[PDB]
RNA sequence: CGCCCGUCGCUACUACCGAUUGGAUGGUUUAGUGAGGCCCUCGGAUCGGCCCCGCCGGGGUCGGCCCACGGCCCUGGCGGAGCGCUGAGAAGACGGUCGAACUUGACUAUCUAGAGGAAGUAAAAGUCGUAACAA
RNA sequence: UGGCUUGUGGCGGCCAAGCGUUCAUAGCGACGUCGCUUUUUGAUCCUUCG
RNA sequence: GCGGAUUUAGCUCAGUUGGGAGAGCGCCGGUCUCCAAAACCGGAGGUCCUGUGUUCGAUCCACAGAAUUCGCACCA
RNA sequence: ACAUCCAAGGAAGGCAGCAGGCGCGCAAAUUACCCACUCCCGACCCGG
RNA sequence: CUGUGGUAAUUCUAGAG
RNA sequence: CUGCUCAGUACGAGAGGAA
RNA sequence: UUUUUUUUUUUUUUUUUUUUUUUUUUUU
């Protein structure tokens with residue numbers, strides 16, 4: 001009963017072995033991405049580049065490199081809807097957000113951790129269906 | 135006391151800004167200490183003779199070059215009227231600015247140099263006495279006073295023969311434009327000396343007409359169409375500490391009050407009036423003729439620009455998917471066909487527009503069709519044509535709101551044609 | 562006719578190394594300098610009261626028919642007006658502790674530029690050899 | 697060092713087929729030919745090792 | 747607002763001094779195959795971004811627009 | 823250390839108090855009405 | 871607190887009762 | 888050599904810019 | 907008392923892109 005401190009100290013230190021716990025523990029989340037841990041960042045379409053799918057899946061994926069506002073850093077982004085390219089023009093303000101928990105992109109996608117959802121401060125769904133905007 | 139908008143027009147260097155500045159001065163609207171400082175600054179930069187002009191010309195490039203570049207607005211008050219006076223540039227590069235000025239005007243002072251060669255140049259084929267007169271007519275200015283300027287100049291020296299020469303030339307041309315020439319004052323002045331600006335000049339005994347101020351009082355105020363729907367073409371948009379983003383422009387039709395919700399077309403952005411100002415005096419309402427700045431809550435400066443038009447939400451300004459017009463061709467070096475794309479200067483806007491069809495050539499005097507779908511038009515022709523603006527443009531039918539329904543066509547920096555819109559297909 | 566390995570040639574992205582004694586940033590600071598208030602040795606623009614003398618006005622007593630007059634006590638006005646003594650009292654000023662800020666460097670914490678060098682990872686297949694799985 | 701000579705170097709020159717959009721010379725000139733030059737370099741052995 | 751660049755084939759770029767364009771991918775097409783890869787044929791493909799001026803003639807020059815870029819100005 | 827207007831001489835300021843502008847960003851309002859309530863502050867009222 | 875004052879200008883402020 | 892007036896002038900369609 | 911047993915590799919590196927298809931009670 002008098003050896004409480006060792007178990008107390010032991011737990012916290014052995015705990016370091018949990019990588020997600022570790023992630024919160026080290027100021028890394030703030031600095032591991034262009035966002036700074038942020039869910040959404042406004043950006044500019046520097047170029048639009050077609051890319052090739054990975055493994056047996058064969059496809060041309062719509063990809064945009066984006067210059068961020070406060071951050072000012074290069075970003076690799078994924079264009080989502082079918083003919084969004086028709087509606088994506090260079091240097092139009094774009095809001096970007098991530099896919100399924102931070103880390104790995106959709107298995108089909110190559111090196112993109114980010115998704116494009118707004119064009120000119122307008123959501124994607126509106127351009128995509130005829131009834132909304134044009 | 136009724137309010138009027140005055141545009142000052144005419145060829146480069148003919149004396150527009152010197153007239154306005156000097157007029158404001160001897161009318162005591164300008165601090166003598168400031169005139170003193172301007173003069174010293176003008177002399178020290180090698181430009182003594184710009185002291186009155188520099189009351190209006192404030193931009194770094196205006197002062198460096200000694201020319202006006204864009205509009206300046208000044209309030210002054212005569213015996214009968216309060217005027218907003220608008221100083222417009224003569225330089226050919228900035229006739230687009232002069233045109234927005236004319237679109238906002240009730241009357242015009244045409245300033246024309248009597249100096250040898252200066253007159254002839256202004257009235258030459260590619261001169262801006264010629265061009266500004268033409269554009270003022272098309273933007274719907276009927277009341278005009280002409281200041282035959284620089285009578286003091288040594289190569290002029292108050293000569294009545296020179297004066298009557300410029301008057302007659304000016305008269306023959308102005309009558310060909312449709313001006314009622316018998317009614318318009320031709321005052322011999324010196325913008326620089328002051329002759330005939332506000333008091334009568336001993337140097338020119340032979341002149342019996344009004345002085346310029348007297349001529350102003352003899353003008354007549356225009357119809358105030360307060361029962362037509364609100365339309366305010368924006369001439370510029372400022373971003374102002376305390377107010378936020380404030381469009382400026384002249385109320386053409388309708389009325390605007392603090393509290394109002396307003397929409398700006400063609401963007402489709404909506405805001406709400408926090409405040410209204412004319413010549414630094416805060417207002418609660420503004421009616422046609424009011425030249426104003428209006429602060430707008432909920433609108434970013436980047437959303438709105440010059441040539442956009444503000445109306446109330448229930449009757450928003452019309453955006454033309456396409457539009458139809460009656461046009462006359464002033465000048466063209468070859469021919470105009472379907473597909474021709476000059477810029478359209480309408481109210482404060484200027485947007486290239488493609489001629490998608492030429493429905494009919496008309497006899498310029500009678501208006502009868504002389505040929506269905508002509509193969510082309512040329513200089514001298516009149517026509518009914520269809521127009522598709524290259525980017526979203528606001529226009530109204532001339533029959534409905536004439537101040538958003540008259541236009542010039544310009545291309546390669548020349549005025550090519552003039553027009554009135556006879557029909558609009560809304561976006 | 563199964564799996565499978567590594568160097569070598571493209572293309573991209575990370576991180577390691579790095580001539581510039583490298584640049585940038587923010588915290589604690591050694592030393593040399595020191596505004597400014599404040600305590601404190603002074604000073605002393607200035608102001609008033611009593612000191613002495615002479616002259617008149619007024620109240621109360623004494624020597625005079627007086628009246629002026631003289632003495633005491635209390636005020637008013639003028640000269641030696643400040644000439645003798647006292648009190649509070651602005652500028653300034655001795656020497657201080659406090660201590661901004663300047664410079665000169667330190668030092669951490671936090672990023673970062675670069676010819677080149679060196680891995681990897683996307684990695685499907687081009688090119689060399691058979692290492693591992695069945696002694 | 698100096699020196700003859702000037703191939704080599706440097707510079708002008710007659711002629712004008714060409715450039716120069718029309719045209720040769722405004723401004724330039726193939727080829728071909730006449731030369732001036734002695735701060736390059738070259739060949740020569742004349743002056744200087746007493 | 748002003749001023750510079752840039753716009754040429756499906757893609758990316760070269761030309762030019764007004765007589766009218768040229769290459770690397772592409773890629774695309776066919777044969778073989780489940781489909782490609784390889785192999786073997788075959789493909790030619792452009793209002794030279796637009797209007798006007800000049801000109802006998804404008805991809806080119808001049809003057810004017812658009813779109814993208816980059817300087818600079820303005821500052822309710 | 824910021825930084826506002828300079829009659830060229832000077833004079834100011836500390837909105838991390840309401841409103842309101844900008845900025846910053848992924849991220850938070852309006853230049854309103856009032857002492858009636860709750861209290862509090864000044865002296866024997868009833869001011870603020 | 872009366873009145874009398876100066877300055878581009880500031881919470882400037884004299885002298886007199 | 889530079890400045891002030893000469894002068895934003897004449898000459899220019901402007902860009903510009905003198906003596 | 908009853909058993910070995912020699913032989914030994916003389917010669918076998920490599921094989922371009924892509925590969926594929928699955929789901930249930932209740933009796934008439």
Ligand SMILES: *C(=O)[C@@H](N)Cc1ccccc1
Pocket residue numbers: 370372380382411426427428822
């Ligand atoms: C804001 O000042 C307007 N109301 C007046 C104005 C100033 C500058 C430019 C345009 C308008």
